[PDB]
């Protein structure tokens, strides 16, 4: 998109001190990582999924059972969910240019909730942050238990720790922006 | 073999009344069944053993685990073991008859007692041992369509499929039933001898 400078710049103008630091983390360390490096790592997620079996359809059900949602698809959804509250406030500030307190605090509160929900979903669904080389599968029509092997498990572990750590930082930065605002009014 | 009539005829002459029946059941209903029909039922046992796996060597070890000794090879050994005590005694009867002529119903008079009563006793034990091995090693007389295998190098448990299990079950039941008949026939010959000497 050739208008990225305009929309990012528009958010940049209508932002506080920390809010400008938060924007550089979301765009440079999260959007670019998901676009230039991570999206190609997951290219052959199912094509290079190898199962030690002769059963037709066993590979399809086993990959589906262990990867109900791809990692890169989860991060694409999370990025969009933590992007609407910031832009909606930014558009409202532009329209205003009082009531801004109840929107700016709400957007920060919503972003923290969204970021913690996705991180929780990542942990519970994928039983940790480490991808295993071998998955044992016993769903129909696979006979007994079938051994299957994941494509690039180590590459995916490095990029998932990187994304989780950055999201953890975004939680901390949004907490301080609440602490800065909380002491102004109710303290 | 072209001398089959010679050996069977010779054994037939040197036998008791029941012993001639036992000659018929052994050759017609055990040797002929094994040769004419049973042997090529098992001809493809490993070739069409099929395992649902991609692991090299898993078919080899799974077939070996479940069929350490083939049925037809077990029957071939049993037939040889239960044939020697009969042939050895029949040869000894010829030597005893040879001595008298050099000086047609077989009668047990002297030292022939401890040979005949032992050949009958050995044949009962040999048949019971093979019937026991058949039951214990193959957990019964029915062959299953599916065997589940987990010996190395098979990953977890692997499904494998036997060639002609029903055909093999039918011939297994036939061979065990005839073998049990031969045991019953042999026990009666002991009873005939037991009431003569020690009764």
From Swiss-Prot, chain A:
Compartments it resides in: Cell membrane; Cell junction, Gap junction
Q: Where are the transmembrane segments?
A: 19-38, 72-92, 104-124, 158-178
Question: What Gene3D superfamilies does the record tag this protein with?
Answer: Gap junction channel protein cysteine-rich domain
Upon changing residue 136 to R, the result is: In a patient with congenital erythrokeratodermia; uncertain significance
Summarizing the function annotation, the protein's role is: Structural component of gap junctions. Gap junctions are dodecameric channels that connect the cytoplasm of adjoining cells. They are formed by the docking of two hexameric hemichannels, one from each cell membrane. Small molecules and ions diffuse from one cell to a neighboring cell via the central pore.
**Protein family per UniProt:** Belongs to the connexin family. Beta-type (group I) subfamily.
Q: What is this protein called?
A: Gap junction beta-2 protein
Which species does this protein come from?
Homo sapiens
| Organism ancestry | Eukaryota, Metazoa, Chordata, Craniata, Vertebrata
Identify the coding gene: GJB2
From Swiss-Prot, chain B:
Q: What is the effect of changing residue 57 to A?
A: In PPKDFN; impairs trafficking; localizes intracellularly closed to the nucleus; affects the ability to form functional channels; phenotype can be rescued by coexpression with wild-type protein
Effect annotated for changing residue 64 to H? In VOWNKL and PPKDFN; impairs trafficking; localizes intracellularly closed to the nucleus; affects the ability to form functional channels; phenotype can be rescued by coexpression with wild-type protein
Its GO biological process annotations read: cell-cell signaling; gap junction assembly; gap junction-mediated intercellular transport; sensory perception of sound; transmembrane transport
GO MF term set? calcium ion binding; gap junction channel activity; gap junction channel activity involved in cell communication by electrical coupling; identical protein binding
- Outcome of residue 32 to A? Loss of gap junction ion conductance, probably due to very low open probability of the channels. Can form functional channels with wild-type, but with strongly reduced channel conductance
Topology in the lipid bilayer is annotated as: Multi-pass membrane protein
Topological domain (Cytoplasmic) residues are 12-18
Q: Which InterPro entries match?
A: Connexin, Connexin26, Connexin_CCC, Connexin_CS, Connexin_N, Connexin_N_sf
A GO cellular component entry from the record: plasma membrane
Stretches assigned to the Extracellular side: 39-71, 137-169
The cysteines covalently paired via disulfide bonds are 51-160, 58-154, 62-149
Disorder cited = Deafness, autosomal recessive, 1A: A form of non-syndromic sensorineural hearing loss. Sensorineural deafness results from damage to the neural receptors of the inner ear, the nerve pathways to the brain, or the area of the brain that receives sound information.
Q: How does it assemble?
A: A hemichannel or connexon is composed of a hexamer of connexins. A functional gap junction is formed by the apposition of two hemichannels. Interacts with CNST. Forms heteromeric channels with GJB4.
Protein name as it appears in the record = Gap junction beta-2 protein
What's the source species for this entry? Answer: Homo sapiens (Human)
Q: What gene name is listed for this protein?
A: GJB2
């Amino acid at each position: 998109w050739g208008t990225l400078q305009t929309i990012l710049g528009g958010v940049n103008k209508h932002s506080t001190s920390i809010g400008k630091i938060w924007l550089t983390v979301l765009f440079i360390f999260r959007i670019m990582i998901l676009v230039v490096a991570a999206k190609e790592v997951w290219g052959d997620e199912q094509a290079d999924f190898v199962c030690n079996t002769l059963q037709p359809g066993c590979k399809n059900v086993c990959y589906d059972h262990y990867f109900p949602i791809s990692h890169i698809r989860l991060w694409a959804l999370q990025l969009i969910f933590v992007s609407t509250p910031a832009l909606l406030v930014a558009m409202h500030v532009a329209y205003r240019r009082g009531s801004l307190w109840w929107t700016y605090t709400s957007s920060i509160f919503f972003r923290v909730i969204f970021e913690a929900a996705f991180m929780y979903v990542f942990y519970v669904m994928y039983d940790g942050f480490s991808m295993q080389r071998l998955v044992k599968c016993n769903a129909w029509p696979c006979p007994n238990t079938v051994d299957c092997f994941v494509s690039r498990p180590t590459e995916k572990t490095v990029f998932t720790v990187f994304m989780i750590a950055v999201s953890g930082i975004c939680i901390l930065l949004n907490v301080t922006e609440l602490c800065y605002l909380l002491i102004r009014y109710c303290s």
